[PDB]
Design a protein around this ligand. Sequence first.
Ligand SMILES: Cc1c(NC(=O)c2ccc(CNCCO)cn2)cccc1-c1cccc(NC(=O)c2ccc(CNCCCNS(C)(=O)=O)cn2)c1C
Lengths: 118, 120
Amino acid sequence: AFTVTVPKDLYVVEYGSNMTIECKFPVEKQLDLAALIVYWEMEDKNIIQFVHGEEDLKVQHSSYRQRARLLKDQLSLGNAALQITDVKLQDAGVYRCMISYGGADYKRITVKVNAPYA
Amino acid sequence: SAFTVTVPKDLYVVEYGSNMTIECKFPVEKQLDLAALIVYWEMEDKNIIQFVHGEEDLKVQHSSYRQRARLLKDQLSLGNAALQITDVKLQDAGVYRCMISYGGADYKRITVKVNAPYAA
Ligand SMILES: Cc1c(NC(=O)c2ccc(CNCCO)cn2)cccc1-c1cccc(NC(=O)c2ccc(CNCCCNS(C)(=O)=O)cn2)c1C
């Protein structure tokens, strides 16, 4: 069965940093953009939806409007990498990545945001 | 205008020992395309039913749903992922999640309340 993996299920990040969280999925041979859906959400907020070789942007939640991107390059390696830029305490929580690619799976990732220090 | 899953009810109140059928609707424009369809039902991370590419998996199905859960295949052609659990117990109360991939993808949550058995 098709299986998604996370290198870490817990990220501890510093306030104001950039954060990149990752879900790995098998790509034998080359990538097939037509068969690939990748969705990231937190607490039911639509962060990034990549459906059929393209991101949506319309249904993306306002709080992630110019902050979240999927690293397109990484998709060909079988890596759904979410970058959130300028991490705030509101970004602490449980992230869910959902992948459909000849099979489907999802995984949960917890983010702790430590308070501003640096 | 993205693909959207709907639930006619997001809360089922069921009697102890009854059968329960919970439903997620998804658009089927023309005929059904079994090759492109994934339907997954889970509760509290337990694999209830996984329908991948015109067939159920059954290897990965959780032990506590082994002879109790089935997807009503007939209903799929109408755009209805219908999960039947037979002989509902109090352990079946909780939050159910159906996940559908068919052209696009969506999921919905359903809460099940199981009322207690009578002394009748
Ligand atoms: C729903 C979804 C999306 N979501 C959206 O795009 C979306 C979703 C929601 C919205 C927002 N709309 C508003 C809603 O309120 C807006 N876009 C994206 C991609 C795929 C899916 C989807 C589809 C169908 C089925 C499944 N799941 C499964 O089939 C599944 C999952 C998990 C496990 C368990 N296994 C664990 C590993 C062990 N592995 S082992 C033993 O070695 O076998 C098993 N099977 C998923 C994840």
